[PDB]
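RETRY 2/3 - previous attempt timed out on the joint model. Re-submitting the same 696-residue input unchanged.
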Amino acid sequence: SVTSKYLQSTFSKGNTSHIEDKRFIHVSSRSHITPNEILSLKFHVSGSSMAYSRMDGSLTVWFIKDASFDKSVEVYIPDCCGSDKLATDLSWNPTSLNQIAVVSNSSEISLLLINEKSLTASKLRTLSLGSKTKVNTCLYDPLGNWLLAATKSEKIYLFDVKKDHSSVCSLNISDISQEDNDVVYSLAWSNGGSHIFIGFKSGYLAILKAKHGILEVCTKIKAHTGPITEIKMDPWGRNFITGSIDGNCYVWNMKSLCCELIINDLNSAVTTLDVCHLGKILGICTEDEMVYFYDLNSGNLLHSKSLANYKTDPVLKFYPDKSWYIMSGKNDTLSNHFVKNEKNLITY
Amino acid sequence: SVTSKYLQSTFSKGNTSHIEDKRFIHVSSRSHITPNEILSLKFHVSGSSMAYSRMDGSLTVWFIKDASFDKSVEVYIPDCCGSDKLATDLSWNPTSLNQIAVVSNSSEISLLLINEKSLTASKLRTLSLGSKTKVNTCLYDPLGNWLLAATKSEKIYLFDVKKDHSSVCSLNISDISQEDNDVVYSLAWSNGGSHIFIGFKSGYLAILKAKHGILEVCTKIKAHTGPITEIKMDPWGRNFITGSIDGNCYVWNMKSLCCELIINDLNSAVTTLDVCHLGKILGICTEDEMVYFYDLNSGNLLHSKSLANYKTDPVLKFYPDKSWYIMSGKNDTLSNHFVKNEKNLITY
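RETRY 2/3 succeeded.
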């Protein structure tokens, strides 16, 4: 019951700060409009940086140095990756401390090294592929050993990041799916780059081996009856969580690959999910503008809330180095959460 | 008394919209700094465009299509006319619908055609003169037949805009003034390019003939006892208004060139003035941060206000096609004014 009180305190009068971004001051001036979006938001591994990209085209990055974003510098940058094209996915390159990979639904993958002394985001390199190929998702092996780039259909590329991003291998999606017109919806890496977990739209789930740089199909299981939205992994490495659009959220055992626990209070589709860095609490953002916080070990609801028709598409992410979580606010504005006197659950 | 009620309604709770520019959102974000300036602001003749230039170097232009700037596009552009040099005066070229002349206190006059489909302001041409010559004011004959460029001393140039801006003539200021170290403070054209009205600093006022492209001194009258700040003309063409820094505002009869009406409630210097497109109401912005609205026909005060130490240097301009007026706000931010149900005074 300690975790329930902790979450309640994290939802209190204080212990909360508004992330002061461009959209925040925009709403402050125009309220005291059509909300663009938040395409994606992804931390650095060491828990001391953050990056995200709205629909306008501008990607913001913060260098966390304070709790309530007091002394946190902010490198705002205009619509990068072209003037017409906007960013859709980014990976933070766990190898170094500054590099970033960004994709813009085009045939060009941009590698930019963000600098913190100035506000200059200088394009370091651009990678290109076949002219028709339209990739939109990039990922980094959590050890910084492989890079993955995926299309909505009929292309999957793996580069070796060590040897100057030499194109290592590729694969046609129709060889992985073997169904009628499947479109990969979400990808994820295993803890320590050894396997790639892919969730198609037709419902299937595939596990590809990427040991020595040669992709191969290990297995395919008919997990869900609708498109798979998100795929997350437990940090301790014992189970991986699958959330779908048919209203189900399962947790699969890693050693044996069989369903072990099911979330049953759900009655709506899932838009995203996330699990804390301690592998203890599981946050589900359903489609009825509502968030839930479940317990991983037992599987019973321990906290609920209600978005109340503010920023229809929400986002949730748990810090990789503290028990804090960034959650969307009212009008596409981010809202930090903490307790200001508890860095981790154990200290509580 | 209809005009007094009209002006009062134009100063009401509603019937007012903030012009949303870069500085506006800047103040909204930093308030919810040192104000740069507004160097100049000048409409298009047809009343469907606006342009102005701050001190930062960036010149904004709006394509009026709405009352409260809802659907009005905005072509923001960075520091044009060089990176070091900033704009000081611009003319809108009544001939065409897009050209603009801009001067930057240098020996180069830039002609740029602003495009509305994109946000691109493309430099069309640059005009150059003697290396030492430092012009800072440009003007267009209200029929689009002549162009005038003036220096702070010892140069006045007139180009023929019809024949590809061929240099038509020039004149040394010392030939016009014939006094001790005079510096031209404000120029203005007569209704239909036939004469140029020049106001020096020593107090004199000169009328030059520019009929067939050859400047000549017609007359010089000792109008004021201090530097002349602004010179405006009545749209009906019967009297021209002169405002000085010694605290006087006179209206001179056009046919006979003799003082006819004097503003006497004034007790401070004048920074600018303007008269509506109907030649009925006269707006004076004095130096004590206060505006007055007088009646042209009678000469008695009909409305007063108070800037109250917000944006020390104010600006006022009356629409050339409606009875609305753009006036500065609190921190170098523009503030439109209207009634939303009265396009012209007559309709009232």
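The helical segments of chain B are 2-10, 22-31, 173-177. Closing ticket.
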